[PDB]
Design a protein around this ligand. Sequence first.
Ligand SMILES: Nc1nc2c(ncn2[C@@H]2O[C@H](COP(=O)(O)OP(=O)(O)NP(=O)(O)O)[C@@H](O)[C@H]2O)c(=O)[nH]1
Ligand SMILES: COc1nc(-c2cccc3c2OCCO3)ccc1Nc1ccc(CN(C)C)cc1
Ligand SMILES: [Mg+2]
Length: 173
Amino acid sequence: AFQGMTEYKLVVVGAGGVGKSALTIQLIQNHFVDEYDPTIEDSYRKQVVIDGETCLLDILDTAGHEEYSAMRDQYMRTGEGFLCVFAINNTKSFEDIHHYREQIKRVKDSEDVPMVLVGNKCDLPSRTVDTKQAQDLARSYGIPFIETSAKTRQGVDDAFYTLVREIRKHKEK
Ligand SMILES: Nc1nc2c(ncn2[C@@H]2O[C@H](COP(=O)(O)OP(=O)(O)NP(=O)(O)O)[C@@H](O)[C@H]2O)c(=O)[nH]1
Ligand SMILES: COc1nc(-c2cccc3c2OCCO3)ccc1Nc1ccc(CN(C)C)cc1
Ligand SMILES: [Mg+2]
């Protein structure tokens, strides 16, 4: 029997200040947060319909810098898919993406972990990471790339829905 909607555990990772929380709060509350309040760890839930299937998204919003290693390993083991977020005006956040991805692959002991590359703050004028560079990186990993703005809401739904589609593909192989 059906016992309730399918649940997906999604984790949002990336460097300090790239907009992890702003993306999530835009999804959950349709609200843009202008303030920068560094996260420790926050948990959100949302019911949505993606490709005709109702599902419950359990979303973990993480700290940019994870001081304490055992807590970080736990959410990497529990997460089924990961949004790897950088900011298109912060080159260093883009270079850090490779490190997040390697850490997740190591902890899950798998080459094929559902992931989406997210280039956030695409509303800002001071772009230092080119779209083409980000697409190349994502193509090298075999994952989708999406440009977002937590401010304008561009790509916000798409980033999360695309990640659910990646998790579904991985569960049906
Ligand atoms: N213009 C613009 N600013 C953004 C965007 N996304 C986030 N911001 C801003 O960037 C700052 C940090 O965003 P926040 O969500 O707190 O980042 P975080 O990645 O969760 N930081 P931490 O890792 O410490 O929790 C905030 O001032 C926020 O308004 C965006 O898409 N466009
Ligand atoms: C415990 O279940 C949850 N687990 C996670 C979660 C997702 C991915 C990785 C993780 C996670 O958790 C810790 C370890 O690693 C997120 C939300 C809830 N749950 C949740 C969140 C918010 C509400 C809304 N409620 C506060 C009003 C309800 C359920
Ligand atoms: Mg945050």
